[PDB]
Structure formats: C-alpha cells, structure tokens
Amino acid sequence: VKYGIVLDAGSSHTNLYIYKWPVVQQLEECQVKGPGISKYAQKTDEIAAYLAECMKMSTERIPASKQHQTPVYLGATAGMRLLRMESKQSADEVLAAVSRSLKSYPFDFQGAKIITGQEEGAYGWITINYLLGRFKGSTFGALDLGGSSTQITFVPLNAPETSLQFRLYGTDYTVYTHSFLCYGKDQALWQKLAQDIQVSSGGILKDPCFYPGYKKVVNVSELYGTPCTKRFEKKLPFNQFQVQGTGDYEQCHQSILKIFNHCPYSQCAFNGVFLPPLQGSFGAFSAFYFVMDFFKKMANDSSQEKMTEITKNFCSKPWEEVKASYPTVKEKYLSEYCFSGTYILSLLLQGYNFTGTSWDQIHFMGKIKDSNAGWTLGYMLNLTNM
Amino acid sequence: KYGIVLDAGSSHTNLYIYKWVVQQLEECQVKGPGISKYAQKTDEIAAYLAECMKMSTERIPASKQHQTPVYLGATAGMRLLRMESKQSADEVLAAVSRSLKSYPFDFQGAKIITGQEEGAYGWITINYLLGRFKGSTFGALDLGGSSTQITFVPLNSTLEAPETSLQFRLYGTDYTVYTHSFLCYGKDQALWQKLAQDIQVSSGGILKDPCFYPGYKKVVNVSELYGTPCTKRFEKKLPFNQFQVQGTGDYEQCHQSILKIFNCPYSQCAFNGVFLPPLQGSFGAFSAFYFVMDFFKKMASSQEKMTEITKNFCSKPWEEVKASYPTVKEKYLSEYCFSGTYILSLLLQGYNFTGTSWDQIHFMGKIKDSNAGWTLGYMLNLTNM
Numbered sequence: 001v002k003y004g005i006v007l008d009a010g011s012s013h014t015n016l017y018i019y020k021w022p023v024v025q026q027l028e029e030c031q032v033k034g035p036g037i038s039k040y041a042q043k044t045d046e047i048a049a050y051l052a053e054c055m056k057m058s059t060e061r062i063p064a065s066k067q068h069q070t071p072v073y074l075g076a077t078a079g080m081r082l083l084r085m086e087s088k089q090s091a092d093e094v095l096a097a098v099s100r101s102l103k104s105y106p107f108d109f110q111g112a113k114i115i116t117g118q119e120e121g122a123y124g125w126i127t128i129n130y131l132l133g134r135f136k137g138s139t140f141g142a143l144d145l146g147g148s149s150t151q152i153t154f155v156p157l158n159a160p161e162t163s164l165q166f167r168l169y170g171t172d173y174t175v176y177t178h179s180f181l182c183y184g185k186d187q188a189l190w191q192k193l194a195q196d197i198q199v200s201s202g203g204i205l206k207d208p209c210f211y212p213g214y215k216k217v218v219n220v221s222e223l224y225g226t227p228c229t230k231r232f233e234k235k236l237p238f239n240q241f242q243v244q245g246t247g248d249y250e251q252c253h254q255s256i257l258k259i260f261n262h263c264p265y266s267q268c269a270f271n272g273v274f275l276p277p278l279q280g281s282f283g284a285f286s287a288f289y290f291v292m293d294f295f296k297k298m299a300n301d302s303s304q305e306k307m308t309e310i311t312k313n314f315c316s317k318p319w320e321e322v323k324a325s326y327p328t329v330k331e332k333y334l335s336e337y338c339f340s341g342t343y344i345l346s347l348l349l350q351g352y353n354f355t356g357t358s359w360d361q362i363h364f365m366g367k368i369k370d371s372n373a374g375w376t377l378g379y380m381l382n383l384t385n386m
Numbered sequence: 387k388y389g390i391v392l393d394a395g396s397s398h399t400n401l402y403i404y405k406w407v408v409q410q411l412e413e414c415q416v417k418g419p420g421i422s423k424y425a426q427k428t429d430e431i432a433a434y435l436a437e438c439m440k441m442s443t444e445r446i447p448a449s450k451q452h453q454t455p456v457y458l459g460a461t462a463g464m465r466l467l468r469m470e471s472k473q474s475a476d477e478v479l480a481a482v483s484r485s486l487k488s489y490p491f492d493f494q495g496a497k498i499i500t501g502q503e504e505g506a507y508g509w510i511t512i513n514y515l516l517g518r519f520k521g522s523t524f525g526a527l528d529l530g531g532s533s534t535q536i537t538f539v540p541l542n543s544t545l546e547a548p549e550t551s552l553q554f555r556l557y558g559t560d561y562t563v564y565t566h567s568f569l570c571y572g573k574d575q576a577l578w579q580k581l582a583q584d585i586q587v588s589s590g591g592i593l594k595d596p597c598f599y600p601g602y603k604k605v606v607n608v609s610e611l612y613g614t615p616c617t618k619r620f621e622k623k624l625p626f627n628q629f630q631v632q633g634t635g636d637y638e639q640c641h642q643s644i645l646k647i648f649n650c651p652y653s654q655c656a657f658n659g660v661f662l663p664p665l666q667g668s669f670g671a672f673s674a675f676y677f678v679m680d681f682f683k684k685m686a687s688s689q690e691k692m693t694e695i696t697k698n699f700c701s702k703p704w705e706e707v708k709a710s711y712p713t714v715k716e717k718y719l720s721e722y723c724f725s726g727t728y729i730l731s732l733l734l735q736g737y738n739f740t741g742t743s744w745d746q747i748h749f750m751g752k753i754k755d756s757n758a759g760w761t762l763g764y765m766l767n768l769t770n771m
C-alpha cells in the first residue's frame with residue numbers, strides 16, 4: 001500500500017489530505033485550525049505550530065516504514081495569489097516558512113507552490129470525474145467556490161487562450177476552465193462593502209445581506225488590505241465602521257449584482273469573460289456545497305424558485321432568532337449565510353447562466369465515495385501518474 | 387526555417403512568411419475583403435486565398451515545405467461574425483481550413499484569436515523587434531477596422547488586478563501586462579456607430595456630416611448599417627433603404643459628434659466603464675494608427691500641430707482633396723478626416739495621452755523590414771522560443 005499527502009492551502013483554511021492506493025482513496029482529512037496561510041505574512045515563525053496538529057496526525061497515521069517514501073505537497077490557491085499580488089516578497093516568505101516546517105517531518109517533501117486557477121479548476125474536474133467512476137462515456141462539469149476565487153470546468157461540444165487539451169485513457173479532451181479571482185464568497189463580500197460604503201456613511205453601514213439585528217465591526221485597513229477592493233478604495237474619515245443587518249433579500253441581491261460588470265462573445269460569465277453554452281451535468285462543491293447544503297436542509301433535505309424563496313424568508317429572521325434556531329452551527333458561518341446564499345444563487349444564475357432548464361443539472365456534493373470533492377486528488381493523480 | 391501566419395482582419399487577409407532572430411521574408415495581401423464576407427459563399431474561399439498561397443509555394447524551397455507551419459489567426463471581423471452566427475463563423479473557418487490543408491504545408495490551425503491574445507502578441511512583436519527584452523519595455527497601440535487594443539506595463543505591479551491583466555514570463559522576466567480590446571472601436575465600426583447614431587428619422591434620406599469634406603457624398607444602405615452588432619444599440623425604424631452622407635467638413639463638430647459614441651468604477655478608465663491604469667512610459671502605435679497619422683505627418687510633431695493640420699484638411703473640398711492626392715485610393719482618402727479626428731480623440735480622451743503624454747507615442751509601420759502586428763509575436767510563441 002502507498003500513501004501521499006497534499007495540503008490545500010485555501011484562503012479560509014488549509015486542509016491536509018492523506019491518500020492511499022494498493023484506485024486511489026482518501027484515507028483521512030485534517031483541517032488546520034485558523035485562517036489560510038496568507039494571514040501569516042507578518043508572523044511566519046508561527047506557521048510551524050499552526051501546521052503542527054495536522055502534521056502530527058499524519059505521522060501517527062501512516063506506518064513509520066512507509067513514511068520516508070511518502071510524498072508531501074502544498075498547493076496554495078487564490079488567497080496566496082492575492083498575497084503575491086500585494087507582495088511577492090511576503091508570499092515567498094510564507095511559502096518558505098511552510099517549506100521549512102514541512103521539510104522537518106519524516107516525509108518526502110515535494111514542494112510548496114501557488115497553483116494556477118487554470119490548473120486548479122482542471123484538477124477538480126478530474127477529481128470529480130474520477131470519483132464518479134466517469135473514467136471507467138461522458139463527464140461532469142466542475143464548479144468550485146472558496147473564500148477568494150470561483151472556478152468552472154467542463155467539456156463543451158466541438159477561444160483557445162482559455163481551454164485545455166488533455167488525453168486521458170486514450171481520449172483527447174478539450175476542457176474549458178476559468179478562474180474568477182476576487183469572486184470567492186469572501187472577497188465578494190469585501191467588494192460589496194467597499195463599494196457600498198459611502199463617505200457620508202457615518203461609520204454605520206446599513207446592509208440588506210445580514211439579518212435584522214446583526215452587527216459586525218469592519219476595519220478599513222483590513223478591508224483595503226486586499227487587492228480585490230483596490231477598485232473601490234476611498235480615503236475614509238473613520239478607521240472602521242459597523243455593518244448593521246436590515247435583512248432584505250431583494251436589495252441584498254440588487255447590491256450583489258453591482259460587483260459584477262456587454263460581452264464580446266456568444267455568451268459570457270461576467271466581466272466580459274467568455275462562457276460557452278451550458279452542457280451536461282455539473283458537481284458543485286466546497287462553499288457551493290456547504291452553503292447550498294445548509295439551505296437544502298430547510299427544504300426537506302429543489303427548484304430555483306423555491307431556493308430563492310427559502311433565502312428571502314431566511315434573510316429576514318432576526319439575528320437572535322437565527323442563532324437560537326441553529327444553535328450547533330459556528331456563529332462565523334451562520335452569519336454569512338444570508339449573504340452567501342444570495343451570492344451563490346446570483347453567481348450560478350446570472351453568472352454561470354444556470355437559468356431555466358439548466359438549474360437542475362447542478363448536483364451539490366461534499367464527498368464522492370466517502371472522498372472529498374476538491375482538486376487535491378486530481379493534483380495527486382497527475383503527480384503520481386497513478 | 388520558415389513559418390506562415392495569415393492575419394485575417396476585417397478589411398484584408400494578410401499572409402506573412404517568416405524565416406530564421408526571426409525576420410519577415412515576404413508579405414502578401416489577399417485581394418478582396420475579410421473572410422467574414424464569405425459567410426454565404428464559403429466555396430469561393432479557396433480561390434480567394436489561391437494567389438497568396440501560390441506565392442508561398444513559389445517562394446519557399448520545396449524541401450522546406452512539409453516542415454513549414456501555417457496558421458490563420460482571425461480578429462475582430464470574425465468576432466463579429468461569430469456573434470451574429472456561431473454556425474457561419476464555423477463554416478467560414480472550416481472552409482479556410484480545407485483550403486489551407488490542401489497545400490503542401492504543415493497545417494496548424496485556423497482560429498479566432500482573442501483581443502487579449504491580439505494585444506499581447508503585438509506588444510511582444512514590437513519589443514522583440516526593438517531588442518527590448520534584455521532593460522525594459524514599450525506599450526502597444528493597435529487600430530484596425532473593427533477593433534482597437536492597448537497593451538502596457540504600469541509601474542504599480544498588480545494594482546487593479548481585474549483580468550484586464552496577463553502574465554507573460556519572457557526571457558527570464560515575469561511581466562504583468564494590462565491589455566484590452568475594444569470591440570466595435572476599430573475605425574470602420576466606429577464610423578458606422580456614428581452614422582447609426584446621428585441619422586435622424588426626419589432626415590429626408592440625407593445625413594449632413596462634419597467628419598467628411600464639403601462636397602463629399604456617399605450613399606449608405608440601411609441594412610448594411612444595421613448589419614453589424616456594433617450599431618445594434620442604435621437601431622431605429624427608418625422610412626428609407628438608403629441615405630446619402632454629405633460632408634460639411636468641420637473638425638470641431640466632427641470631434642463633438644465622435645465623442646457621443648463614447649461613454650467608471652475605478653480611479654480611471656479608458657471609455658465605457660472599462661479600467662485603464664495610469665499611462666506609463668513610451669508607446670508604438672501601429673496598423674491604422676500608423677497609416678493614418680503618417681499621412682497627416684507628411685503634410686508637415688506635437689498634438690496642437692496635428693490638430694491644426696486636421697482641422698485644415700477637413701475643410702478642403704472633396705474635389706480639391708481628390709485632386710491634391712490623385713494616387714490614393716478614394717476608399718482610404720475619403721476617410722481620412724474622420725479617421726484623423728477619431729485617432730486624435732481615441733488617444734487623447736480615451737487613452738488620456740493628453741498634454742505631456744502625447745510625445746511618448748511613436749507611430750511605426752515596420753521595424754527591421756518587419757511589420758508591427760501580432761503575427762510575428764505569434765510566431766515566437768508558435769516555436770516556444
């Protein structure tokens with residue numbers, strides 16, 4: 001039996017996966033407590049301890065004899081793309097600190113790098129299609145959404161810059177992939193606040209994307225701390241402000257549409273980016289999954305008309321009610337949900353154009369065959385040549 | 387070694403033969419308009435391409451021929467055709483392919499390149515040719531019938547990061563290049579936008595126009611005018627099949643009326659809500675920037691100067707003008723007042739080359755007996771240099 005370890009260093013979490021193979025399977029997953037590694041830009045010496053728990057789990061989990069032969073990879077995504085954008089130097093320092101830390105365990109260190117969006121979207125499409133056994137025919141589109149970027153990867157029926165050719169089990173595949181940096185659910189929220197905060201705000205932001213009675217305090221330097229808001233930057237007369245929920249789905253939608261900008265093609269995603277016509281089935285995972293899943297589970301674990309209605313209803317539940325109603329859910333997720341859901345609906349319908357007949361062809365999944373839908377398996381695959 | 391690239395633009399298809407530093411060996415302009423005009427009559431494509439293709443088989447030694455790659459890259463003319471009919475565009479591309487496939491070269495594809503792939507390659511093309519990769523680089527302004535690109539590195543590094551951005555690692559340097567392509571902002575499509583806008587229902591079937599010389603007349607068919615996606619936003623029910631353009635030959639007013647077919651979340655934009663970073667460093671403007679500005683230059687430097695020259699030229703009656711320049715094709719000559727004024731607004735208001743910035747632009751036809759154009763830049767890619 002063989003083992004491999006891949007760390008998915010995304011902008012909200014670093015997730016470590018252990019794979020094994022006598023078909024390859026996920027043996028275990030570990031979520032590193034804390035945010036993504038880019039938040040370590042100053043305090044890179046703390047990275048070692050940050051990674052310690054998930055790394056110790058792996059040394060306790062893989063037999064000692066198999067350990068020096070076991071490869072270890074870190075692939076970083078949009079969070080780190082943004083950090084690099086801000087400071088090449090910082091991003092490098094973070095990657096090096098990660099490296100020193102992983103190098104020290106008794107595994108075969110294989111590199112820490114920022115993978116491209118074009119790679120990432122590809123690999124996740126591989127992971128899913130592998131997992132469904134759809135490589136044992138015709139295939140599933142891959143929709144990914146994290147804190148910072150969102151990807152879409154699928155095969156259309158017979159704009160080269162954007163495509164990938166790839167031969168896999170005797171078949172040559174042309175796969176459309178694209179990554180919208182700044183369009184993960186969190187960066188969108190930033191974009192939306194930046195844009196909506198006027199100078200006259202008073203340090204108070206009434207917002208329809210959050211529940212009546214929610215309050216959250218937001219720091220201007222953090223908010224302008226990311227490249228995704230450079231475009232809305234103003235010099236502000238206060239060093240922070242407080243978001244106040246008005247919980248109105250209508251308006252929150254309206255206001256979410258504003259962070260997206262005619263199209264030079266047959267049809268587009270948004271921002272002038274080409275999108276081919278929709279084709280076949282899709283699996284929507286990560287934030288897509290977790291968010292939709294929370295809403296689905298108020299619809300007897302349905303349609304776009306019904307999902308929208310569920311969200312409108314939910315967004316108006318006062319905050320105290322929402323908390324009390326879902327007491328076992330982390331306050332940090334629970335608060336995002338009205339925004340996230342509203343956001344996800346728009347991204348799929350106006351964004352990826354999943355309107356009309358197209359809506360039901362999306363199947364939301366966390367795991368296939370007890371293995372996480374993500375890109376790290378795909379990355380694993382190509383990397384092992386298994 | 388040799389390679390061939392066809393530049394299928396909206397007015398002309400141009401074939402380039404490169405050989406190898408890489409040099410243009412020869413160029414051939416295919417007679418007729420661009421391939422999109424073949425949408426119905428795709429079987430005619432073969433003969434249309436025949437002259438320039440035979441030239442190449444006569445030109446490259448036979449032994450070198452099977453090893454020689456051949457590419458066709460199509461630009462905004464074909465983007466517009468695809469926008470009207472996916473199917474048509476595909477049929478055109480296929481007909482082109484069957485035709486090219488039949489020659490004894492190494493057929494490497496016929497495709498519509500993106501405005502960014504377009505702005506990219508052209509920017510690469512000039513910097514290669516100016517020996518710039520060794521140092522730092524020049525901006526690229528390209529203008530054609532249907533579209534206009536602008537491509538340059540801003541000081542900022544990443545700032546706006548909107549996907550108006552590329553990476554291009556090139557002989558050891560990773561370059562963050564801003565590039566955009568304004569579809570329908572080529573000189574011709576901008577002309578038709580302007581007519582389309584300014585035509586009033588009441589008109590009688592005559593459009594008085596100040597971008598044309600006193601005494602200029604041209605008859606324009608309404609179904610051609612509305613036949614492009616670019617005047618879609620301007621369509622109106624008109625009580626006539628055609629109308630006549632009549633120059634009143636006034637630059638002031640031409641400028642006025644040109645501005646109107648232009649419309650910003652950002653610190654700054656180009657036009658129409660599209661981001662543009664701060665202008666930075668120097669630029670080579672080419673294709674129609676060069677063929678039009680060079681014409682005016684030859685009636686002499688500075689921008690107030692090129693303005694005075696265009697105001698004056700726009701007043702010369704059409705009979706005078708045609709007599710003054712008898713060796714020029716009436717099809718180009720008749721457009722110059724408009725193009726000059728256009729170019730001047732595009733550079734100054736669009737791209738903000740106002741004041742001080744102006745003199746950073748060097749218009750250029752060709753560097754080292756090689757054309758400014760995307761094609762050579764493509765060529766260096768299509769041999770992973």
Ligand SMILES: [Cl-]
Pocket residue numbers: 009010011012036037038039078079080
């Ligand atoms: Cl991160």
Ligand SMILES: [Cl-]
Pocket residue numbers: 010011077078079145146147148149184
């Ligand atoms: Cl992400």
Ligand SMILES: [Cl-]
Pocket residue numbers: 011012079147148184186187
């Ligand atoms: Cl994020």
Ligand SMILES: [Cl-]
Pocket residue numbers: 212213214318319320321
């Ligand atoms: Cl409350």
Ligand SMILES: [Cl-]
Pocket residue numbers: 325326327328329
């Ligand atoms: Cl709960």
Ligand SMILES: [Cl-]
Pocket residue numbers: 394395396397419420421422423463464
């Ligand atoms: Cl054409």
Ligand SMILES: [Cl-]
Pocket residue numbers: 395396461462463529530531532533534572
């Ligand atoms: Cl063009």
Ligand SMILES: [Cl-]
Pocket residue numbers: 396397463531532572574575
């Ligand atoms: Cl044109």
Ligand SMILES: [Cl-]
Pocket residue numbers: 710711712713714
């Ligand atoms: Cl002459």
Ligand code: NA
Pocket residue numbers: 268269270349350351352353
């Ligand atoms: Na859309």
